[PDB]
Amino acid sequence: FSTSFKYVLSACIASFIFGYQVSVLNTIKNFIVVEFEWCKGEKDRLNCSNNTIQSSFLLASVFIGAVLGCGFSGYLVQFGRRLSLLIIYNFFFLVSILTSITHHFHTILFARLLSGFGIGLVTVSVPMYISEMTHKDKKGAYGVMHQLFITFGIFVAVMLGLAMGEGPKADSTEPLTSFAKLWWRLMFLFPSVISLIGILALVVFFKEETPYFLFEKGRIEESKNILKKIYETDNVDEPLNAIKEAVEQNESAKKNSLSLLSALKIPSYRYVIILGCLLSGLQQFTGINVLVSNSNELYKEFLDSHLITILSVVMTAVNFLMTFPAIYIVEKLGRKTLLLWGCVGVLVAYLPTAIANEINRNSNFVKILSIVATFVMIISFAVSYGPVLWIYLHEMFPSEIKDSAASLASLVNWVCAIIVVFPSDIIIKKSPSILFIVFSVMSILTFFFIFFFIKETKGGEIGTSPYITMEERQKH
Ligand SMILES: CCCCCCCCCO[C@@H]1O[C@H](CO)[C@@H](O)[C@H](O)[C@H]1O
Ligand SMILES: CCCCCCCCCO[C@@H]1O[C@H](CO)[C@@H](O)[C@H](O)[C@H]1O
Ligand SMILES: CCCCCCCCCO[C@@H]1O[C@H](CO)[C@@H](O)[C@H](O)[C@H]1O
Ligand SMILES: CCCCCCCCCO[C@@H]1O[C@H](CO)[C@@H](O)[C@H](O)[C@H]1O
Ligand SMILES: OC[C@H]1O[C@@H](O)[C@H](O)[C@@H](O)[C@@H]1O
């Protein structure tokens, strides 16, 4: 509950909007389907081809938007981290209002595409802000707060969706409740109020920018004040000197015309960047978004509306609760060890499920095992790979490519989200065993990847990497 902790709370407000925006549409989609009358032409008003295609575009728009958001964020952060947060809040305020008043597939598609862009901004900005506003020994611990409120956002959106009539019947013709028509729009409108809270927090209490940013553009004295404020100490010679060395290397870098595109042709920098993009993209091959995006579609085959609803609530609850231990584990045991154990937990989840489905595709025992395996996969991901990745991406790079490569890696993550989710939706309908055996193989490969190539980044100074040492960065 330090000061640096009030500051990360201010940044985690955007992380709450992150999680909320990702899961809000999925929660109340069926209501939109009936109201917008996407399948009013056919007998079934909830299940038709038109709904499937348009829902695919809606999900794709968020992912694509997130890709663009991550790319632009690399350029936007240059003018400030706190500035990025302010822009995010102002942006989400209008986008949420716009989404609240949509009446057609095109306007809501446009709204979600924008909402995705804001998400891509949050993906890079918030973990970077927390990175430069916390103690080096407590970076990881607070870095979990980012993932924590993401998880919390996903949970709150599901909880608010319980105020609904728990869904309209697919074969019925009963019109929605006037309350239900109002409430799903209000759910879209809720992050506008949250955005206002985010703006108020930054402009009233947390006016300062990060000490790293302030020092980088000349504000040395003002950098000292915010540095002394977050550390609660008059003597801040060591972290200031760490920033001074990082910034000086940035100045030498700009002189050598070093950029992300230029560093890629340098084998020393290419190595750490490729490793960063690999680790970032491999988070999606855990299949976590397959569950997040299609929680209803996955269990619609052997579970009814009420149980799917209960399952959704419990899944998001566990996904949120199991994030808390990461605050202690990430720093105490390290990031690499947690990643390795996380991969083991993922393997333990998918491989027995793959074997069970291969033996018998329609066994009752398989259905039950699939439910338990879900929670095993959720607990494993929520405690490790989820939180750690965004913490690691802002600890593994030298200062010259610190922000740019982190943005590139974040972009790859959302690109892989497109690569994993949509084909998985097609595969799991044909043969779940094949999809589950691919995830098992990927879980093993990811284990070996981290085990052999990934180094620990705990307690590292700002702008330092375990891969490239200071003197080695000078010859470049
Ligand atoms: C740019 C600000 C616009 C906000 C205007 C709010 C007016 C009252 C909102 O009630 C609206 O009543 C419509 C009747 O057709 C419904 O269709 C629509 O779903 C519902 O939202
Ligand atoms: C960000 C989303 C942008 C979507 C752009 C889609 C452009 C091509 C489709 O245009 C739409 O053709 C419909 C015919 O079905 C018309 O009914 C509707 O009035 C019109 O808008
Ligand atoms: C890691 C957890 C991933 C799960 C997140 C996706 C959950 C999507 C929300 O589902 C919906 O929940 C509503 C209750 O709010 C139900 O009324 C509705 O029937 C159901 O479709
Ligand atoms: C990658 C997202 C899912 C993570 C792992 C959770 C497995 C839960 C899904 O269970 C599977 O549901 C299929 C529905 O098609 C059934 O056919 C199959 O028998 C059953 O095993
Ligand atoms: O909590 C679930 C979320 O965790 C984040 O770490 C992943 O990047 C998201 O794709 C996932 O949806």
Residue 186, ligand 1, Cβ within 6 A? no
What is the spatial distance between Cα 231 and Cα 77, in angstroms, rounded to a whole number?
23
Q: What are phi and psi of 475, to 5 degrees?
A: -65, -5
What is the spatial distance between Cα 368 and Cα 411, in angstroms, rounded to a whole number?
36
Contact 214, 82 (CB under 8 A): no
Count other C-beta atoms under 10 Å from residue 129's C-beta: 27
* Cα of 423 from ligand 2 centre, angstroms: 26
* Cα of 279 from ligand 5 centre, angstroms: 14
What is the spatial distance between Cα 13 and Cα 15, in angstroms, rounded to a whole number?
5
**Nearest Cα to Cα of residue 390 among 292, 247, 467, 276:** 276
Secondary structure string (H, E, C) spanning the chain: CCCHHHHHHHHHHHHHHHHHHHHHHHHCHHHHHHHCCCCCCCCCCCCCHHHHHHHHHHHHHHHHHHHHHHHHHHHHHHHCHHHHHHHHHHHHHHHHHHHHCCCCHHHHHHHHHHHHHHHHHHHHHHHHHHHCCCCCCCHHHHHHHHHHHHHHHHHHHHHHHHHCCCCCCCCCCCCCCHHHHHHHHHHHHHHHHHHHHHHHHHHHCCCCCCHHHHHHCCCHHHHHHHHHHHHCCCCCHHHHHHHHHHHHHHHHHHHCCCCHHHHCCCHHHHHHHHHHHHHHHCCHHHCHHHHHHCHHHHHCCCCCHHHHHHHHHHHHHHHHHCCHHHHHHHHHCCHHHHHHHHHHHHHHHHHHHHHHHHHCCCCHHHHHHHHHHHHHHHHHHHHCHHHHHHHHCCCCCCCCCHHHHHHHHHHHHHHHHHHHHHHHHHHHHHCHHHHHHHHHHHHHHHHHHHHHHCCCCCCCCCCCCCCCCHHHHHCC
What is the spatial distance between Cα 187 and Cα 177, in angstroms, rounded to a whole number?
16
**Long-range contact list for 378-381, CB < 8 A, 24+ apart?**
378/291, 378/315, 378/318, 378/319, 378/322, 379/318, 379/322, 379/345, 380/342, 380/344, 380/345, 380/346, 380/348, 380/349, 381/286, 381/288, 381/342, 381/345, 381/346
Contact 159, 175 (CB under 8 A): no
What is the spatial distance between Cα 152 and Cα 159, in angstroms, rounded to a whole number?
10
What is the spatial distance between Cα 290 and Cα 314, in angstroms, rounded to a whole number?
17
| Experimental method, per PDB record | X-ray
**Nearest Cα to Cα of residue 12 among 142, 137, 135:** 142
Residue 172: what residue type?
A: S
Closest ligand 5 atom number to CA of residue 123: 8
Sequence-separated (6 or more) residues with CB below 8 Å from residue 163: 183
Count other C-beta atoms under 10 Å from residue 333's C-beta: 12
Q: What are phi and psi of 437, to 5 degrees?
A: -85, -20
Contact 136, 459 (CB under 8 A): yes
Count other C-beta atoms under 10 Å from residue 413's C-beta: 24
Ligand 1 site-directed mutation target among 34, 99, 100, 101, most atoms within 8 Å of CB = 101
What is the spatial distance between Cα 115 and Cα 100, in angstroms, rounded to a whole number?
12
What region, left, alpha or beta, does residue 182 occupy, with left being phi > 0 and alpha being psi -120 to 50 degrees?
alpha
**Distance of alpha carbon 72 from the chain centroid:** 17
Contact 13, 143 (CB under 8 A): no
Sequence-separated (6 or more) residues with CB below 8 Å from residue 431: none
Closest ligand 4 atom number to CA of residue 429: 15
Number of domains in the chain: 1
Q: In terms of residue numbers, what domain contains 118?
A: 3-475
What is the spatial distance between Cα 387 and Cα 158, in angstroms, rounded to a whole number?
21
Whose Cα sits closest to atom 16 in ligand 3? 309
What is the spatial distance between Cα 211 and Cα 222, in angstroms, rounded to a whole number?
8
Contact 120, 61 (CB under 8 A): no
Whose Cα sits closest to atom 18 in ligand 3? 309
Q: Helices 81-100 and 105-131, interaxial angle, to 10°?
A: 160
Ligand 3 site-directed mutation target among 46, 294, 295, most atoms within 8 Å of CB = 295
Contact 192, 24 (CB under 8 A): no
* Cα of 27 from ligand 4 centre, angstroms: 19
Question: What is the CATH number for 155?
Answer: 1.20.1250.20
What is the spatial distance between Cα 207 and Cα 80, in angstroms, rounded to a whole number?
12
- Minimum-distance ligand to the CA of 18? 5
What is the spatial distance between Cα 159 and Cα 164, in angstroms, rounded to a whole number?
10
What is the spatial distance between Cα 420 and Cα 229, in angstroms, rounded to a whole number?
43
What is the spatial distance between Cα 396 and Cα 463, in angstroms, rounded to a whole number?
8
Q: What are phi and psi of 321, to 5 degrees?
A: -65, -40
- Overall residue count recorded for the chain in this entry: 476
